[PDB]
């Protein structure tokens, strides 16, 4: 289930693409891996740009 | 939070939706969120 760097849609140049990278996961205490995945909000139920339009 | 590999955000989300979450030691020997208990108390 670990992301295996194939799912990454790279934007860095070709010479910067890792040949073998694994996502850091909370199993094994995050002590192994190469990258992480960030998201804007933990739970995403509302559109922020709509709140601006409402006010 | 650095003591154990729990990923507290998923724990809080699961608790708020009402699951009976289980945390404990796995085969790795590292504390993590095991599966939720179903049905019985």
């Amino acid at each position: 289930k670990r992301l295996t760097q194939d799912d990454i849609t790279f934007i860095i140049p070709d010479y910067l693409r890792p040949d073998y990278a694994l996502e850091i996961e909370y199993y094994d205490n995050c002590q192994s891996g190469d990258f992480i995945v960030l998201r804007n909000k933990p739970v995403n139920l509302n559109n922020d740009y709509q709140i601006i339009e409402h006010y | 939070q650095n003591s154990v590999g729990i990923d507290f955000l998923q724990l809080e989300i699961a608790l708020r939706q009402g699951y009976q979450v289980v945390v404990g030691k796995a085969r790795n020997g590292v504390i993590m969120i095991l599966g939720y208990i179903q049905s019985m108390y």
Partner: peptide, 23 residues
Amino acid sequence: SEAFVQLEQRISSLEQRLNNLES
């Protein structure tokens, strides 16, 4: 797949040993 089970068990024991060593 007996060798597969042996390898998995060896890996798991190694993970437990490393977890104990680090903490």
